[PDB]
Amino acid sequence: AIAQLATEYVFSDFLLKEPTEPKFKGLRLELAVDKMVTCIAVGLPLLLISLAFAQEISIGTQISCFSPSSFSWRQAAFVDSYCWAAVQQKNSLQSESGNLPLWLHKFFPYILLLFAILLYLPPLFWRFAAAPHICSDLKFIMEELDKVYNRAIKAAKSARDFKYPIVEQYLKTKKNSNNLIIKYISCRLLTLIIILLACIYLGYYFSLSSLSDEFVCSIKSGILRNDSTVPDQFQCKLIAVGIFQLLSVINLVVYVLLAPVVVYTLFVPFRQKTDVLKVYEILPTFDVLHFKSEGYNDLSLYNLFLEENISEVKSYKCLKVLENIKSSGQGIDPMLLLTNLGMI
Amino acid sequence: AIAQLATEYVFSDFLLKEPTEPKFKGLRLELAVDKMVTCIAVGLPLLLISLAFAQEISIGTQISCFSPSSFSWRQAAFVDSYCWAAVQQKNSLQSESGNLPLWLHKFFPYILLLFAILLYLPPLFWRFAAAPHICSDLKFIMEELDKVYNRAIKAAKSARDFKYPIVEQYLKTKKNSNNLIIKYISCRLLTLIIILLACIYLGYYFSLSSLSDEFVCSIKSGILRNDSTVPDQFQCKLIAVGIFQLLSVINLVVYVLLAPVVVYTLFVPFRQKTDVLKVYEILPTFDVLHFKSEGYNDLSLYNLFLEENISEVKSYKCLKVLENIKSSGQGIDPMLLLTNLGMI
Amino acid sequence: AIAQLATEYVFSDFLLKEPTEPKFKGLRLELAVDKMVTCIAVGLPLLLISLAFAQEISIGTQISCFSPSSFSWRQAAFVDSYCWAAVQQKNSLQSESGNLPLWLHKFFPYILLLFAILLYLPPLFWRFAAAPHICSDLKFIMEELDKVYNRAIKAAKSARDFKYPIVEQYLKTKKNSNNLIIKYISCRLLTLIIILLACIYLGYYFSLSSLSDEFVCSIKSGILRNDSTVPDQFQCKLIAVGIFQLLSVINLVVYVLLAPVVVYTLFVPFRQKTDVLKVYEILPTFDVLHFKSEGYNDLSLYNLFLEENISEVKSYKCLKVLENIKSSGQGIDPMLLLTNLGMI
Amino acid sequence: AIAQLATEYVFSDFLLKEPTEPKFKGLRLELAVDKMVTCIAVGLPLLLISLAFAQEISIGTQISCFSPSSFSWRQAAFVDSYCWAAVQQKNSLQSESGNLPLWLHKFFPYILLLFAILLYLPPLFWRFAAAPHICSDLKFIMEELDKVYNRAIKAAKSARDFKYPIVEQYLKTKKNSNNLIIKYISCRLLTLIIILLACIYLGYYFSLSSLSDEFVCSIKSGILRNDSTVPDQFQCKLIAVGIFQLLSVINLVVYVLLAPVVVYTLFVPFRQKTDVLKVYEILPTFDVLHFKSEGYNDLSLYNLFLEENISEVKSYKCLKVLENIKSSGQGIDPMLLLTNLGMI
Ligand SMILES: CC(C)CCC[C@@H](C)[C@H]1CC[C@H]2[C@@H]3CC=C4C[C@@H](O)CC[C@]4(C)[C@H]3CC[C@]12C
Ligand SMILES: CC(C)CCC[C@@H](C)[C@H]1CC[C@H]2[C@@H]3CC=C4C[C@@H](O)CC[C@]4(C)[C@H]3CC[C@]12C
Ligand SMILES: CC(C)CCC[C@@H](C)[C@H]1CC[C@H]2[C@@H]3CC=C4C[C@@H](O)CC[C@]4(C)[C@H]3CC[C@]12C
Ligand SMILES: CC(C)CCC[C@@H](C)[C@H]1CC[C@H]2[C@@H]3CC=C4C[C@@H](O)CC[C@]4(C)[C@H]3CC[C@]12C
Ligand SMILES: CC(C)CCC[C@@H](C)[C@H]1CC[C@H]2[C@@H]3CC=C4C[C@@H](O)CC[C@]4(C)[C@H]3CC[C@]12C
Ligand SMILES: CC(C)CCC[C@@H](C)[C@H]1CC[C@H]2[C@@H]3CC=C4C[C@@H](O)CC[C@]4(C)[C@H]3CC[C@]12C
Ligand SMILES: CC(C)CCC[C@@H](C)[C@H]1CC[C@H]2[C@@H]3CC=C4C[C@@H](O)CC[C@]4(C)[C@H]3CC[C@]12C
Ligand SMILES: CC(C)CCC[C@@H](C)[C@H]1CC[C@H]2[C@@H]3CC=C4C[C@@H](O)CC[C@]4(C)[C@H]3CC[C@]12C
Ligand SMILES: *[C@@H]1O[C@H](CO)[C@@H](O)[C@H](O)[C@H]1NC(C)=O
Ligand SMILES: *[C@@H]1O[C@H](CO)[C@@H](O)[C@H](O)[C@H]1NC(C)=O
Ligand SMILES: *[C@@H]1O[C@H](CO)[C@@H](O)[C@H](O)[C@H]1NC(C)=O
Ligand SMILES: *[C@@H]1O[C@H](CO)[C@@H](O)[C@H](O)[C@H]1NC(C)=O
């Protein structure tokens, strides 16, 4: 039913499932905006496919040819099925709009499924190629941040009663390499191109005259070519073509609204803001150097992933509340850190 | 529905399920490229089979023979079913394209299922014959790497405050044996041959005239042979043949795009690059000798499997970050290793 | 659907499920070749049964008798159902090929299910009679091997810083008894005989003229015997008989390919090779005596089961890597064993 | 589908499910032969019921009466349904074989279900009445055996470096009481009687002329009794009667093969062999007295249950391997027991 389709595709965790494995425990591995874009671009065409053939919206068979009254039920059924299979056969049918509109009307669900698969492909390539590496690197970075926070609080407590910036060096090294950012931009660009092509196709499909679904059909090949009792042609109409056009314009609207989001996603350096690591600069055990901005490198992408999935880090949360309290400046950062006692 | 089939076969973990057993905990046991190739080559023909008979794309019955108006519904049904069963019986039907096109049109789903099964067979043979051995060997290798890393860090800590290369000897011994690599190449080659045969068949099927689905049928055997009221022949058409041809060309395109991937897979030594063990050479407890390249031996395959599923090793990750930091050369490898404190 | 059947029967763990109980944790209890043979011989006929009546391959009802035009729909339905039930009644129908072909055409699914059940019976008898005993014995043997390995490594460590061969005596005693091997050979032989009988039946079924599905039917018993308006006979055809013959020849090919595998399985002593226990002979705590070969006794079967499910034993894996390293001979077996430190 | 029914009823754990409760952890509570007999006798008739009405074997409706051509579809449907309901009404129909064959043809599924339920009743009575008691007693016996084995090995170890036979006294007391064995024999005898009655019924059903399914039907009661346009009688045939007879003879064959098994089961004392407790007689802490044989008492049944579910006992397994080694006599039983070190 329509409501069942809605529950499956919008109100359920459709493509929102976290990786089912212990390797990525709590790691999104995909930005929220990218996940939203993929979920829409994939589950919208599927939802429209399901809707267009819902038991309520669908009168019945997808084509009716209006055989003569003399024709029996199965003769008329032969006519309808023959014309359905003959939309491909150009000789059989003669339609003013041509045969491409008939092909599109017959295979619209296939085309929507193709667009959905093509849009799901780049996210899958990301999740299967560049996701494990970033997952491991980000897990190491979070562990290093937790360890340095613990060491700093232990030092502060000892004072009240190595020291090498490994994480900073690793981030600096990531500043050079760009394979991950190149893959990310390539997959986003392919998604954008697929969306644009889908928009072109949907606009063309919705621009039809709405009468191209009606085509003339001739069961006059073979032994029936010279038969007399059979009329030379029939009036066939492809039902649900109006529904297809409505859903196609809906998908076109959604995709044109979505494309600016993908374009904004492509410009990762601009998105790289609100320095996540700036909060850690007040730790004595952490060097006061952010050095993450203004670069078409994997460093900006790692900064984005950190700003996305750093809320799970207790040390980061503690430092964030310390920073927020520092806005008033009533107290002192080391005193607040010592009082917090948030090692684990 | 179409969307349900898509969710099952592309958006779900179809053939992507990890081995459901404690023996292989986190071990892929199959390269990512090989898994992708198998998943496509298997779940594409199944998806096309499901699509070709979807409740929306399917007008109804798969053949209609256009019985005379005088014929009753069940007489016409007898005609249609008789011709459906008589596509095999050459005498009954007379078609310009022959009888092989009719056989193919009737049994296209069976042929796609056969290709899917034949393509799934070599992966299954691998997973049931050569997977347990490589799993055990690779688990031992990872355990040995973890143990040697722990011993090296313990030695470094003791200095700050046996020694036999068992793993290196085991890898060197693997350099000689080649049964695993021979099995891998044989299964990949069989997959490639099956893909090529499927491409040949799909090209032949799509090259049909598109009118071979229309065949002349004669229910004139037995007591009806000399009956007069029955016409000497009927005009039967195999519905969904156009859909079969469309999906067959789609599968042909996918398989021709996939075959280069399989050929590239066959050349494992070329794939053997980015030495995974090179990072471990900086450990005092590990001998400085990689000795893994340029060989049609199981050593290259083991190197590939390591480069695939070594990200799960904390010691390997730590050594990798140490290597990446060494690019700048600001610090020292032993000092960084001591500061890391990543025993477990 | 066809794809659903494929997923259930070939791509899923159909009859590949491990024993659902804590008694056999990780124990196959069935050789890989035997499991493959049983899985094929059982799930192939079931798959063919499901395929032959798939919603796509099936035109509709399994028999159509072509009642006269004057006959109403339910009169024709009576004719068809009567002939379907009268394939058994020899007097009612008169077919050139006889009545056995009609019986076979009607009950082919039943015959395939019968063959599947008969082929599944010997494996079930094995798993319910001789599996618990071998499971317990093999678990004891693995525990003894682990314990002796632990004792030997402890002795080596003590030197660096009872002694009775219970397992060897148990294996020697198993050398005498042969009930398990006799049961194994009997079940394999029964499976082979069932496969041969199935091949005979399928060859006979596929050798039919292909026109035996068309039989003459007479609803002329009872009050209708002397009725005039009803024709003396009808032309009935059993639909799906061609599909049955195709699937029967497929099953015949599979079974003839499989029978050599079963024959090879029957010769267990030849299969008994690559001595698993030879690796343990280098342990000081283990006597240097294999004494397992060239016998129609349960010892060979136990050797096969060990070679099958010994990879799960850490001590065996360690000894195997020690053996492989010994190929070069660079080091020493006791030194390598001491350095391994693989007690648990 | 047929394959689905097979998977449910033969290839699945149909009635093979262990008690879903912590009270019986690993205790069969039912002998293997009895479980096999019950599973067959119950799931065979159910499987045949499902098969006889499978979507493939079933042409359609279960009765067709061949109404005149003048009759409309729903008039013919009224005729068919009336005759279906009138098989009971003797006046309406006049059949040569009588009315009992028609009753049986109509209610064969009900009769098979009745036999299945009646055969499942005694096993259920056992499992709900006499199973908890034997479970508790056998769990106590196994615990006592484990404790005495532990005490004996501890004594042997102490020597190398109460004593009352509670279990033997309990078994001796069980030698007197016979309520459990009486219940077991009664349930087995009732199962045998039900099987014999089912065989009688199936033989009678299969001995029919095969034409009793065709009966004459008269819709001539009420206002239609003196109606003229309606014929005085119709020719009705009960479809699937041949399938019923085939499946009934199959069930008859299975049950006649099974009855000897039940008779052999009834003679429990003969089955009481291969003394399970004989292995424990070599323990110093266990008295050398078996005293379990030649009795129509619960002791023999307890011996059977022990021989069935004693493999799960580590002490029993250890003593069994000691016994098997004693066949050669090379070593000594106490020395082997001390060396085993199998307390837990
Ligand atoms: C997904 C991508 C490939 C879709 C591409 C656009 C498709 C949907 C449409 C939009 C405009 C269309 C074209 C418009 C006009 C013509 C001229 C005609 O004489 C032949 C077909 C041809 C050349 C059409 C082919 C299909 C077309 C290119
Ligand atoms: C992503 C955004 C830009 C998509 C907006 C939809 C645009 C591309 C659509 C809307 C209307 C469409 C046009 C409608 C009609 C025709 C006439 C036909 O003979 C050729 C294609 C052509 C000229 C279409 C080309 C594509 C089109 C201009
Ligand atoms: C999967 C593999 C086996 C498929 C092999 C190719 C199949 C699909 C096709 C492609 C070309 C075909 C052949 C083309 C021409 C002829 C000549 C004709 O007089 C008999 C059939 C025969 C000999 C065909 C047999 C089937 C064929 C070989
Ligand atoms: C894997 C790649 C190479 C597959 C590409 C598809 C090729 C092999 C296909 C496409 C068109 C096909 C041809 C189309 C028509 C015919 C004529 C027929 O009488 C014999 C087969 C023959 C000659 C086919 C042979 C196979 C063919 C050449
Ligand atoms: C599974 C086993 C039992 C199958 C045995 C073979 C079956 C399928 C077939 C193969 C050959 C067949 C026989 C061939 C010829 C004849 C002669 C005829 O006048 C009576 C039937 C009889 C005697 C057939 C009986 C059934 C038969 C034996
Ligand atoms: C396991 C292997 C050997 C099976 C190979 C199939 C063999 C046994 C098949 C293939 C063709 C079959 C024959 C085909 C036709 C007939 C004629 C009939 O009147 C009697 C049976 C007989 C003679 C069949 C006997 C069995 C047969 C020879
Ligand atoms: C499950 C048990 C109760 C089944 C008992 C046997 C049933 C199936 C059958 C087998 C033989 C049958 C009897 C055979 C002959 C006659 C004589 C007739 O004039 C009245 C019915 C009567 C008396 C039948 C009654 C039903 C009967 C007893
Ligand atoms: C468990 C074993 C013994 C069952 C074997 C089936 C036996 C009991 C079957 C097979 C054929 C049957 C007979 C077939 C025909 C008739 C004639 C009828 O007027 C009375 C019942 C009677 C006489 C049946 C009695 C039961 C019968 C003898
Ligand atoms: C139909 O009849 C016409 C008459 O002109 C003839 O040309 C043509 O070949 C016939 N077609 C068939 C299929 O027999
Ligand atoms: C049909 O009638 C023809 C007349 O020539 C005859 O040859 C043939 O045998 C008959 N067929 C049947 C099946 O009776
Ligand atoms: C049908 O009529 C014939 C005429 O010869 C007669 O012999 C036969 O008994 C009748 N059959 C029935 C069932 O009344
Ligand atoms: C039918 O008509 C007959 C004429 O003899 C009469 O006896 C009978 O009562 C009538 N039945 C009904 C139900 O009116």
Q: What is the 3-state secondary structure (H, E, C) of chain C?
A: CHHHHHHHHCCCCCCCCCCCCCCCCCCCCCCHHHHHHHHHHHHHHHHHHHHHCCCCCCCCCCEECCCCCCCCHHHHHHHHHHHHHHCCCCCCEECCCCCHHHHHHHHHHHHHHHHHHHHHHHHHHHHHHCHHHHHHHHHHHHHHHHHHHHHHHHHHHHHHCCCCCHHHHHHHHHHHCCHHHHHHHHHHHHHHHHHHHHHHHHHHHHCCCCCCCEEEECCCCHHHCCCCCCCCCEEEEECCHHHHHHHHHHHHHHHHHHHHHHHHHHCHHHHCCCCCHHHHHHCCCCCCCCCCCCCCCHHHHHHHHHHHHCCCCHHHHHHHHHHHHHCCCCCCHHHHHHHHCCCC
Check CB contact under 8 Å for A85 and B56: no
Check CB contact under 8 Å for A74 and B67: yes
Out of D59, D242, D311, the one facing C88 most closely (by C-beta) is D242
List the one residue out of B97, B147, B173, B87 whose CA is nearest residue B316: B147
Name B64's bridge partners.
Answer: B237
Whether the CB-CB separation of C45 and C113 falls below 8 Å is answered with yes
**Rounded to the nearest 10 degrees, what angle do helices C298-309 and C179-206 cross at?**
80
**What CA–CA distance (Å, rounded) separates D80 from D66?**
8
The helix or strand, by DSSP H or E, that contains position A35, with its residue range, turns out to be: helix A32-52
Check CB contact under 8 Å for B84 and C239: yes
Q: Report residue B79 as tokens.
A: 């005609």
| CA C200–ligand 5 middle distance (angstroms) | 9
Can you tell me which residue has the tokens 């001595």?
A: C275
Q: Report residue C268 as tokens.
A: 């267990």
Burial state string for B261-290 with b = 16 or more CB within 10 A and e = fewer than 16: bbeebeebbebbeeebbebbebbbbbbeee
Collapsed DSSP state (helix, strand, coil) of residue B262: helix
- The CA-CA-CA angle for residues A186, B188, B134, to 5°, reads 95
Query: Residue D252 CA: which ligand is closest?
Result: 8
- Chain C residues whose CB is inside 8 A of the B140 CB are 317-318, 321
List the one residue out of C6, A189, D129, C175 whose CA is nearest residue B50: C6
Check CB contact under 8 Å for C67 and B82: no
Q: Report residue A240 as tokens.
A: 């649900």
Q: Report residue A122 as tokens.
A: 């780049």
Residue type, B151: R
Do D and B touch, 3+ Cβ pairs within 8 Å? The answer is no
**What CA–CA distance (Å, rounded) separates B288 from B283?**
8
Burial level of C189, CB count in 10 A (0-12/13-18/19+)?
middle
CA B95 to chain centre: 38
Q: Report residue B143 as tokens.
A: 């355990």
For residue A70, what is the DSSP state? Answer: T
**What CA–CA distance (Å, rounded) separates D280 from D303?**
14
* Helical spans, DSSP H, in B207-285: 241-266, 268-271
Name B217's bridge partners.
Answer: B93, B234
Collapsed DSSP state (helix, strand, coil) of residue B330: coil
Collapsed DSSP state (helix, strand, coil) of residue A237: strand
Contacts with C128 (C-beta within 8 Å, 6 or more apart), sequence order: D32, D36
- Chain D residues whose CB is inside 8 A of the C77 CB are 60-61, 64
Contacts with A112 (C-beta within 8 Å, 6 or more apart), sequence order: A45, A46, A48, A49, A251
**What CA–CA distance (Å, rounded) separates C65 from C47?**
29
Whether the CB-CB separation of D208 and D95 falls below 8 Å is answered with no
Q: What are phi and psi of C329, to 5 degrees?
A: 75, 15
Within 10 angstroms of residue A25's Cβ, the number of other Cβ atoms is: 11
List the one residue out of D52, D45, D57, D47 whose CA is nearest residue D12: D47
CA C75 to chain centre: 46
Mutate to test the pocket of ligand 10, among B225, B227, B229 (most ligand atoms within 8 A of CB): B225
Whether the CB-CB separation of B244 and B205 falls below 8 Å is answered with yes
**What CA–CA distance (Å, rounded) separates D76 from C123?**
51
Within 10 angstroms of residue A212's Cβ, the number of other Cβ atoms is: 20
Can you tell me which residue has the tokens 């023996």?
A: B23
**What CA–CA distance (Å, rounded) separates C12 from D214?**
46
How many Å lie between the alpha carbon of D4 and the closest alpha carbon of chain C?
9
For residue D234, what is the DSSP state? Answer: E
Whether the CB-CB separation of B213 and B65 falls below 8 Å is answered with no
Burial level of B14, CB count in 10 A (0-12/13-18/19+)?
middle
The β-bridge relationship of strands A234-238 and B234-238 is unpaired
Whether the CB-CB separation of C177 and C297 falls below 8 Å is answered with yes
Burial state string for D36-72 with b = 16 or more CB within 10 A and e = fewer than 16: bbbbbbbbbbbbbbbbbebebbbbebbbbbbbeeebe
CA B286 → CA A293, B151, B163, B300, C305, distances in Å? 39, 10, 8, 20, 37
- Chain B residues whose CB is inside 8 A of the A174 CB are 324
**What CA–CA distance (Å, rounded) separates D255 from D307?**
27
Collapsed DSSP state (helix, strand, coil) of residue A214: strand
Please name the residue of chain B whose CA is at the shortest distance from the CA of residue A174.
Answer: B324
Q: Report residue B183 as tokens.
A: 């099995």
Check CB contact under 8 Å for D211 and C89: yes
CA A273 → CA A298, A321, B188, C204, D5, distances in Å? 15, 19, 47, 77, 62
Question: Taking the CA atoms of chain C, what radius of gyration do you get in angstroms?
Answer: 30
Whether the CB-CB separation of C153 and C321 falls below 8 Å is answered with no
**What CA–CA distance (Å, rounded) separates D302 from D180?**
9
For residue A149, what is the DSSP state? Answer: H
Out of C74, C109, C137, the one facing D2 most closely (by C-beta) is C109
The helix or strand, by DSSP H or E, that contains position D216, with its residue range, turns out to be: strand D214-217
- Chain B residues whose CB is inside 8 A of the A163 CB are 339
Whether the CB-CB separation of B79 and B234 falls below 8 Å is answered with yes
The helix or strand, by DSSP H or E, that contains position B41, with its residue range, turns out to be: helix B32-52
Burial level of C266, CB count in 10 A (0-12/13-18/19+)?
middle
**What CA–CA distance (Å, rounded) separates D93 from D215?**
7
Q: Which residues line ligand 9 (CB under 6 A)?
A: A 222-223, 225-226
**What CA–CA distance (Å, rounded) separates D27 from C23?**
11
List the one residue out of D318, D47, A273 whose CA is nearest residue C167: D318
Contacts with B149 (C-beta within 8 Å, 6 or more apart), sequence order: B280, B283, B315, B318, B319, B343
Chains with 3 or more CB pairs under 8 A to chain A: B
**What CA–CA distance (Å, rounded) separates C12 from B339?**
49
Q: What are phi and psi of D237, to 5 degrees?
A: -130, 135
The DSSP annotation for A284-336 comes to: TTS-S-----S-SSHHHHHHHHHHHH-TT-HHHHHHHHHHHHHTT--S-HHHH
Burial level of C224, CB count in 10 A (0-12/13-18/19+)?
middle
Nearest CA to ligand 6 atom 16: C204
Is the sign of the CA dihedral D20, D25, D28, D30 positive or negative? negative
Residue type, A47: L
**What CA–CA distance (Å, rounded) separates A99 from D284?**
96
Whether the CB-CB separation of B240 and B53 falls below 8 Å is answered with yes
Check CB contact under 8 Å for A222 and B216: yes
Does the C-beta of B224 come closer than 6 Å to ligand 10?
A: no
Does the C-beta of B226 come closer than 6 Å to ligand 10?
A: yes
Out of C84, C110, C133, the one facing D239 most closely (by C-beta) is C84
Whether the CB-CB separation of D33 and D261 falls below 8 Å is answered with yes
Does the C-beta of B199 come closer than 6 Å to ligand 4?
A: yes
How many Å lie between the alpha carbon of D177 and the closest alpha carbon of chain C?
30
Burial level of C15, CB count in 10 A (0-12/13-18/19+)?
middle
For residue B223, what is the DSSP state? Answer: G
Burial level of C102, CB count in 10 A (0-12/13-18/19+)?
buried
Residue type, C344: I
* Helical spans, DSSP H, in chain D: 2-9, 32-52, 73-86, 100-129, 131-160, 166-176, 179-206, 241-266, 268-271, 298-309, 314-326, 333-340
Mutate to test the pocket of ligand 5, among C190, C200, C202 (most ligand atoms within 8 A of CB): C200
Can you tell me which residue has the tokens 């020493």?
A: C332
Long-range contacts of C139-144 (CB under 8 A, 24+ apart): C139/C27, C140/C170, C140/D317, C140/D318, C140/D321, C141/C167, C141/C170, C141/C171, C141/C302, C141/C306, C142/C310, C142/C312, C142/C313, C144/C170
Nearest CA to ligand 7 atom 20: D100
Collapsed DSSP state (helix, strand, coil) of residue B64: strand
Can you tell me which residue has the tokens 């019945």?
A: A60
Can you tell me which residue has the tokens 């049904």?
A: B77
**What CA–CA distance (Å, rounded) separates A285 from A42?**
46
Name A236's bridge partners.
Answer: A215
Check CB contact under 8 Å for B136 and C311: yes
Does the C-beta of D225 come closer than 6 Å to ligand 12?
A: yes
- The CA-CA-CA angle for residues D187, D190, D194, to 5°, reads 140
Whether the CB-CB separation of C52 and C244 falls below 8 Å is answered with yes
Within 10 angstroms of residue B160's Cβ, the number of other Cβ atoms is: 10
**Rounded to the nearest 10 degrees, what angle do helices C241-266 and C179-206 cross at?**
150
Whether the CB-CB separation of D25 and D139 falls below 8 Å is answered with no
CA D79 → CA A103, B275, D65, D72, D218, distances in Å? 49, 83, 7, 11, 9
Query: Best of C12, C64, C79, C315 to disrupt the B interface by mutation (most B CBs within 10 Å)?
Result: C64
Residue type, C230: V
**Rounded to the nearest 10 degrees, what angle do helices A298-309 and A179-206 cross at?**
80
| CA C245–ligand 4 middle distance (angstroms) | 29
Contacts with D147 (C-beta within 8 Å, 6 or more apart), sequence order: none
The CA-based diameter of chain A, rounded to the nearest angstrom, is 109
Check CB contact under 8 Å for B7 and A128: no
**What CA–CA distance (Å, rounded) separates D57 from D55?**
6
**What CA–CA distance (Å, rounded) separates A7 from A16?**
13
